[PDB]
Structure formats: structure tokens, C-alpha cells
Design a protein around this ligand. Structure first.
Ligand SMILES: O=C1N=c2c(F)cccc2=C1NO
Ligand SMILES: [Ca+2]
Ligand SMILES: [Ca+2]
Lengths: 146, 95
């Protein structure tokens, strides 16, 4: 836990993502809004625990001091190679390590937020390493996380 | 910068026992695991005389307490990933 001056400054900008009304404190209500905008559905009790874990003085909200104190203890990151490969595996219909270019285009143009057909062409150009119209997604994910 | 990396999850499930409802749940369920393990063992290995109804009763209380502990542990895992979601969101300002 040793935040540089730079990280301290950019975590101030980070505070505003949570402090939705700018009053200097994060409430359970603001964390519910934030969490749901990330597509999660924490219960009231879970939101209370989020706050209470960080609220040093016990006034029910998180201020930037307590917020930054928590951040300092959680800076360590880890690579996501395997989680990403499992996301690809959701579309590996026959469980053979491969998704065809046509199926990748189908998935990417219809599910989630979607890509344009021009965007999927650039994706597939990188993903079909062998030019065989098939994507070995383990290898593709390894190249993107290399 | 961080590219595709995300906040690393803590080694083992450790957190959020400040909840005090989770902590009451762990204390009560764990003691009940201790209680029914002892009572099942006694009624199967320290009696001359296995009373199968006694054993069924404590088997039921045993699985209930074990699964309560499981339930708390999964809830702690959910809370940890919720908190790591917020840490990950804030770490995007480092980019
Ligand atoms: O418990 C938390 N509440 C947080 C928050 F608002 C922002 C960033 C991280 C947070 C936590 N980590 O454990
Ligand atoms: Ca606020
Ligand atoms: Ca506070």
C-alpha cells in the first residue's frame, strides 16, 4: 500500500464515478445505481456491507479518505487470460477448441453490445491466425494477452 | 497500462465478517456442525445399540449446518467480487 501522487490524483476522478451527486460521500443508494449500471444486482444488505467495510468512522457513507485508504490495499492485479478463454468457450458449440469465422461473426453481430460487420472483419483477420476460417480461441486469447 | 488485467482476488475467503449477521450465522452453524458431528459419531460408534432414528435426526441437523456454512462462504465470495468490481471500475482512471 503506497499510492503514488499520480494514482492519488486519478483516484479522485475515480471517486466521481461513485459519488453520483458530488456531495463528497458515497451512499448505499449511489452504489446500487453504479452496481446496476455495471449489470449487477446487489441486495440492500450487500450494499450496506460494501459501505460498512470501508466506512472508517461509522457515519454510514464513504468519503474520499476512506475510499482511497481501501484502494491502497487492493492495487494488485492479475492476468485474465483464462477467464477470457472461458468466455470464448461459451460459443464453442462442439467443444473442440474452435469457433468458425462465420459463427464468430454471427455471435459478434447479434449478441451483447455487438460489433459492426467492418469491426468483425478486423477481429477475424487477427483471430484466424492460420487463415483456415477457424479461430483457435486459446491461441487468439494468448496473443491478445501476451 | 493494465490492458486486460483485473484486481486479484484475495488468497482465501477471509472477509466481511464485520457484517455481524454473517458472523452470527457462522458461529451458530459452525457450533451446530460440531454438535451434530459429535452426536452422529456417538450414536454410530460409541453406542452398543445404533438407534437409526436418532441417527437420521442428527444427519438432518448435520447437513443443515454444513450447508449453512457453505451458504455463508458463497455469500462472502459474492461480496468479495462485488467489491473487486468497484475496485476495477476505479482502476480504469489509472489509464
Ligand atoms: O468495499 C468497497 N467499497 C468501495 C467503493 F466505493 C469504491 C471502490 C472500492 C470499494 C470497496 N472495496 O472493498
Ligand atoms: Ca453522493
Ligand atoms: Ca464515512
Amino acid at each position: 500500500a503506497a499510492l503514488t501522487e499520480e494514482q492519488i490524483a486519478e483516484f479522485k476522478e475515480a471517486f466521481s464515478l461513485f459519488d453520483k451527486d458530488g456531495d463528497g460521500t458515497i451512499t448505499t443508494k449511489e452504489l446500487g445505481t453504479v452496481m446496476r449500471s455495471l449489470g449487477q444486482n446487489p441486495t440492500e444488505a450487500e450494499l450496506q456491507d460494501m459501505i460498512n467495510e470501508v466506512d472508517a468512522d461509522g457515519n454510514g457513507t464513504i468519503d474520499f479518505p476512506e475510499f482511497l485508504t481501501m484502494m491502497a490495499r487492493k492495487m494488485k492485479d492479475t492476468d485474465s487470460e483464462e477467464e477470457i478463454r472461458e468466455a470464448f468457450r461459451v460459443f464453442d458449440k462442439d467443444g473442440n477448441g474452435y469457433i468458425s469465422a462465420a459463427e464468430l461473426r454471427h455471435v459478434m453481430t447479434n449478441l451483447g453490445e455487438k460489433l459492426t460487420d467492418e469491426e468483425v472483419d478486423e477481429m477475424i483477420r487477427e483471430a484466424d491466425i492460420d487463415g483456415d476460417g477457424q479461430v483457435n480461441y486459446e491461441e487468439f486469447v494468448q496473443m491478445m494477452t501476451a | 497500462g493494465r490492458k486486460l488485467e483485473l484486481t486479484k482476488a484475495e488468497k482465501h475467503v477471509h472477509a466481511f465478517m464485520m457484517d455481524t449477521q454473517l458472523t452470527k450465522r457462522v458461529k451458530n452453524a459452525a457450533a451446530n456442525v460440531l454438535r451434530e458431528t459429535w452426536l452422529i459419531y456417538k450414536n454410530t460408534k460409541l453406542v452398543k445399540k445404533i438407534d437409526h432414528a436418532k441417527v437420521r435426526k442428527h444427519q438432518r441437523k448435520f447437513l443443515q449446518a454444513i450447508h449453512q456454512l457453505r451458504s455463508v462462504k458463497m455469500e462472502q465470495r459474492k461480496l468479495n467480487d462485488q467489491a473487486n468490481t468497484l475496485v476495477d471500475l476505479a482502476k480504469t482512471q489509472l489509464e
